[PDB]
Each structure stands twice: as structure tokens, then as C-alpha cells.
Structure 1
């Protein structure tokens, strides 16, 4: 009930530490700080997908049986009855999702001056912290990096 907070704190601390571990040699031991916010999905998840594959094309149909009646006279009277018992592919997943994944991460990174770092020297560091974030575009992950002197 409250231990969700503890687990989220542990995840955020882990990411914070890894970001520092990557970035510190680039700028120094105390020239950077990071903080993490983790939206953690604690809802109990069960799923069941039962896809069938479409047998619309007789080129890829699987028949078990087929009764076929074709009749015609010639006043041309033609009749054609047809019965098809098909048989079908089936795929049944039962994905019971884990409890407690990350649905969203927001990270802000602050870098000290050496005098500010140059444009390349900024884009590389932000790309590194992106990479160490596990930054997922489909997860709505968010990154804000800024350069300024500390206190």
C-alpha cells in the first residue's frame, strides 16, 4: 500500500546513480546532479488474446469436409449447392502482465560550468543520459538537461 513508494524510490535512485556513473567522468565528480520521477503501474493485469488466422482465400483455406452439388439443364436452368466445413488456425495468448513496471519516466539533469560547455559537448551528454535512462519513446519518457554554475 505504501511500499509502492519505496519501490518507486528504489527505481528512481537506481536510475539517478547510473546517470551519475556515466556522466561524472565527462564533467567531474560534483559537476552534475540528476533526479528521477517514475510513474509505476501497480494495477493487476490479465490479458487473453485469441487470434484466428483468416481463411478467406481458398489458396490458404483448410477444409475438413466439402459437399458440392452442381446441376444444370439446357430455358437454361442451372443450380449449384455447396457446403464447406472449414478448419481454422488458432492462437491463444494468456499474458498476465507483471505488477509494477515503469509506464513513464521524467528526468532532469543539471551540469556545472567548467564557463559553459559547448553545443556538441551538450548534445553528447544529453544523448548519453537519454541512453542511460532506458529512454523509451513509446513510454512518453521525458528528459530536460541544463547547463549553469552551481552554488
Structure 2
């Protein structure tokens, strides 16, 4: 029931990422000379979070006060000195409440496998690509897939001649 809807959601996301990669990889490598497939680890767990933050007021310069009683006594007779300080302070503090409801269906970790073809010249020899072109393909695929390191995304692009 709901599981099938989630699976179809994942399939559509993967297909659209695949198409976005293919769109940029087509003009330079050529139609059919590139194949990519995407798998997506998604987030279907309902989470609700409330965050409370208090600004520190331990420093007297940023401390906000409402009432303060400072009783000071010094009975000098060091000799028979007698110092007494009774201090009472009531503070008002900064407060920030944030309520967050995470979206259901977010992407947790995306791994993408891309395979490119060789280059057959007018003679027909399948000449492999170069390192610079491979790096360009890797960068383009990283851009298309929305590659990020916090998610833990992995990308692998290899070059090999396609079968007949």
C-alpha cells in the first residue's frame, strides 16, 4: 500500500537524476555512448523536533537584569576587619524556540554508477578516452547528481567499450 507509493517515489527520483546526468553527458560523449543508473536511499520516517536555546549571561557586560539588591558592609576596627557582601540578582535571558517538522521523502545517500563508451574513429578503432575528459565527466556527473559529502554520496564513472 504505502510501501508501493514510497517505492514509486524512489523510482521517479532515481529516473529523473538519471535523465539529468544523461542530458549533459549526451552532447559531448554522444547519444548512446553513455549509460547511467541511480539508486537513492530515502527518508520515510516522520520526525518532529523542538529546539530551545538560551543565550549565556555569565558575563556582566551582556547580562540583562530586572532587579538587583547589593548589601555591602565594612566594619574596620588587617586587624578586626569585617567585610560582608550580600548580592541578589534576577536576570532576563534571550530565548529562541524552533519547531521543525522534517519532510517525508528526503534523500539520505545517493550513489550513482555511470559507464561511458570508447571512441571509434573513421577507421573504426575503439580509442579510449583521456584522463582530462574522464575528470570532466566526473565533475559533470557530480554536478548533475547534486554530489555532497555530508550525505555520503559515492560516484563511480568507468570507461569501457560497449558490446554489440
For the pair 1:91 / 2:93, whether they are aligned, the reply is no
Superposed CA offset, 1:39-94 (max 9, x none): 00000010111001101111100001111100010100110000000000000000
1:26 to partner: Cα distance: 1.0
Q: Secondary structure at the match of 1:117?
A: coil
Equivalent residue of 1:137, what SS?
coil
* Per-residue deviation, residues 4-32 of structure 1 (Å, max 9, x unmatched): 10000000000000000010111100001
**Aligned twin of 2:161:** 149
Aligned-partner Cα distance in 1 for 2:31–2:68: 77
Whole-Å separation in 2 of the counterparts to 1:59 and 1:29: 67
1:81 equivalenced with 2:86 (yes/no): yes
What is the Cα deviation at residue 149 of structure 1? 0.5
Instruction: Give the length in aligned residue pairs.
Output: 150
Deviation at residue 2 of structure 1 after TM alignment: 1.8
* TM-score of the superposed pair, with normalisation by structure 2: 0.90
Of Structure 1 and Structure 2, the greater strand share is in 2
Shift of 1:147: 0.2
> Deviation string for 1:91-148 (max 9, x for gaps)?
000011111100000001000001x110001001111000111111110001000000
For structure 1, the residue ranges without an aligned partner over 5 or more in a row are none
Q: What is the alpha-carbon distance in structure 2 between the residues aligned to residue 38 and residue 130 of structure 1?
A: 15
**Structure 1 runs, 4 residues or longer, greater than 2 Å off:** none
Structure 2: how far apart are the matches of 1:97 and 1:64? Answer: 38
* Partner Cα separation in structure 2 for residue 143 and residue 131 of structure 1: 11
Alignment partners' CA distance in 1, 2:129 and 2:66: 72
TM, length-normalised to structure 1: 0.98
Bigger CA radius of gyration: 2
